Design an enzyme around this catalytic site. Structure first.
Site, PDB file in Angstrom:
ATOM      1  CB  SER A 142      -8.796  -1.749   4.819  1.00 20.82           C
ATOM      2  OG  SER A 142      -8.083  -0.897   3.969  1.00 20.82           O
TER       3      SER A 142
ATOM      4  N   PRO B  95       0.821  -1.204   0.000  1.00 21.85           N
ATOM      5  CG  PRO B  95      -0.688  -1.549   1.705  1.00 21.85           C
ATOM      6  CD  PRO B  95       0.613  -2.029   1.200  1.00 21.85           C
TER       7      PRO B  95
END
Ligand SMILES: CN1C=CC(CCc2cccc3ccccc23)C=C1
Ligand code: NA
Ligand code: NA
Length: 575
Positions: free
Chosen positions: A509, A91
């Site tokens: 998320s 990420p």
């Protein structure tokens, strides 16, 4: 004293997990496949059967280990994954846009940020990070000790996560420099760091000393990089240079101007994959857990190898660094000895990375009609409300629900990482069918009851997961304990329903932040989305990824479906 005082990860009852599993999957497979899975699960879970034997082995593992899933989960989620790390795995966190009139302004920022990293690491190593509490119940702090001391080695079939004078590595023009951050044992000042970064920028511009862009190799598939690295280690110069990178605190990447408008979407692309070899894509070393990017044009952020820590801890660290920023021998170039063999590997790696750059479909979408304040006025948790909105967005665009992933922290327990919240619930299905099936003509009052029941079911699954009572980690450990008995897995885990259940076509998320930064990542299956959101009092930021190869998915169409779903849910809550 020496031992943790935290509870160990619970082992859920076998029959609880098997019943939740079947209920999770009934609406996501065909009736005929479900009927066969019901019989497989019944046989697996029968009295005196294999499931009970594996559950007994799991209770013995729990007694003998700090955390019975750590090893299986690290391998299953990260180290076995063969995909290249950029986009598929690592990420990125994008900071606010910075304004750097001159190179010296970029370097002062980099010097300030390095100083902040040294200060934070000193707090970490003196065990001075105040213990996080749930929302409080104390949480495991072991992920903090992996922020700076981790390196992910490639392997042919399984990677290795390695824990280790201190130095950072500075990447400039695809060249790597060792920057020692202490001299005479005294930490270098912000001014000294500036002076050192200037030397690096001068050296990196020298064509007669320019070395091949070895960092590009770390952007490739993991088995491909394992093979190329094995060629490198045949030479002692390369071994020395790889050792320096493996043992650094972090990378600081002085990127070149990107040449495109510095929109949030474009800054995120530069953080995710550097725009490929022709831009900043080789100015990287993806095996190292933190690569801070400080670009000449003010694009700044951090790229994260997330095998050693999850997003909450990463954001705690980066928010601390950014808030802290509000308050002499020459660096050494790392040498490389290459071959025509390595040149072939570099060309291959550049081509493969370009396929990832072109394949990513990425949008940053800021929903601005409302955020947390409105949601809480509906007696709903913001996270559960937004997860139901994502189910409605997926259904209205694609006309089915799919296995959905949402990370749930299990840091209440020793060494805890995450378990999965399965947001594609039966209650979500009832709601999205009622909303979208205009022929059924379900009254809005009934849609609102279904909405609140879906939010209630989402909230319940979330409590289940964070208390160690959900199913994915439990099934993973039963599976790997079965594999230790016999390499032929039992029907329970060869069943197409089980395989389907773990292909997360929607992977999500929540990463809340307190400053203007935001987090993003790619999808985890070729026909999937990645959706990472940042809920604020009056807005919600969505970072949506998908792959252009997949004709079904579209990040811009999904962002529009998210907007429409949040507006529909607002209207239902306003009857
Ligand atoms: C497909 N996917 C990927 C990641 C997550 C959650 C972990 C995470 C999210 C966002 C930033 C992170 C930065 C550092 C470490 C973990 C981070 C959920 C789904
Ligand atoms: Na899980
Ligand atoms: Na697509």
């Amino acid at each position: 004293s020496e031992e943790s005082g935290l509870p160990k990860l619970p082992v859920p009852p076998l029959q609880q997990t098997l019943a939740t599993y079947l209920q999770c999957m009934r609406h996501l497979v065909s009736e005929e496949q479900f009927r066969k899975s019901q019989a497989i699960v019944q046989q697996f879970g029968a009295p005196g059967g294999l499931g009970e034997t594996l559950q007994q082995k799991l209770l013995e593992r729990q007694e003998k280990t700090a955390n019975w899933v750590s090893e299986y989960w690290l391998n299953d989620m990260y180290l076995n994954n063969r995909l290249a790390l950029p986009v598929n795995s690592s990420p990125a966190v994008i900071f606010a846009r910075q304004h750097f009139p001159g190179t010296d302004d970029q370097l002062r920022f980099a010097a300030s940020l390095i100083s902040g990293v040294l200060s934070y690491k000193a707090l970490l190593d003196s065990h001075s990070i105040p213990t996080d509490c749930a929302k409080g119940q104390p949480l495991c702090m072991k992920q903090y000790y992996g922020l700076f001391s981790s390196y992910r080695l490639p392997g042919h079939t399984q990677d290795t996560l390695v824990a280790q004078p201190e130095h950072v590595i500075v990447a400039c023009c695809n060249q790597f420099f060792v920057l020692d951050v202490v001299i005479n044992f005294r930490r270098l000042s912000e001014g000294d760091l500036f002076t050192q970064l200037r030397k690096i920028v001068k050296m990196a511009s020298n064509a007669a000393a320019r070395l091949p862009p070895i960092g590009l190799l770390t952007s490739d598939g993991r088995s491909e990089w394992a093979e190329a690295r094995t060629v490198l280690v045949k030479d002692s110069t390369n071994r020395d240079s790889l050792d320096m990178i493996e043992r650094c605190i972090c990378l600081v990447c002085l990127d070149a101007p990107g040449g495109v408008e510095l929109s949030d979407t474009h800054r995120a692309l530069q953080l995710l994959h550097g725009g490929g070899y022709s831009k900043n894509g080789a100015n990287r070393w993806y095996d190292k857990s933190l690569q801070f990017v400080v670009g000449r044009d003010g694009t700044c952020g951090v790229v994260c190898e997330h095998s050693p820590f999850d997003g909450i801890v990463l954001v705690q660290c980066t928010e601390h660094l950014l808030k802290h920023m509000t308050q002499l021998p020459a660096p050494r170039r790392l040498r490389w000895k290459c071959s025509p063999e390595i040149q072939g590997h570099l060309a291959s790696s550049a081509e493969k990375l370009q396929r990832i750059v072109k394949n990513l479909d990425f949008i940053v979408y800021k929903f601005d009609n409302y955020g947390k304040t409105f949601i809480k006025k509906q007696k709903c948790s913001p996270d559960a409300f937004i997860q139901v909105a994502l189910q409605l967005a997926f259904y209205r665009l694609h006309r089915r629900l799919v296995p959905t992933y949402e990370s749930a922290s299990i840091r209440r327990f020793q060494e805890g990482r995450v378990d999965n919240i399965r947001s594609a619930t039966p209650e979500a299905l009832a709601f999205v069918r009622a909303v979208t099936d205009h022929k059924a003509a379900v009254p809005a009052s009934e849609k609102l009851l279904l909405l609140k029941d879906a939010i209630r079911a989402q909230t319940a699954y979330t409590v289940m997961a964070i208390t160690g009572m959900a199913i994915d980690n439990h099934l993973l450990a039963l599976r790997e304990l079965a594999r230790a008995m016999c390499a032929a897995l039992p029907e329970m885990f060869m069943d197409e329903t089980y395989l389907m259940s773990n292909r997360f076509v929607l992977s999500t998320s929540q990463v809340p932040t307190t400053t203007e930064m935001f987090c993003c990542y790619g999808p985890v299956v070729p026909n999937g989305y990645g959706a990472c959101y940042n809920p604020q009092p009056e807005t919600i930021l969505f970072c949506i990824s998908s792959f252009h190869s997949c004709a079904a998915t579209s990040s811009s169409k999904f962002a529009k479906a998210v907007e429409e779903s949040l507006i529909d849910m607002r209207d239902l809550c306003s009857l």
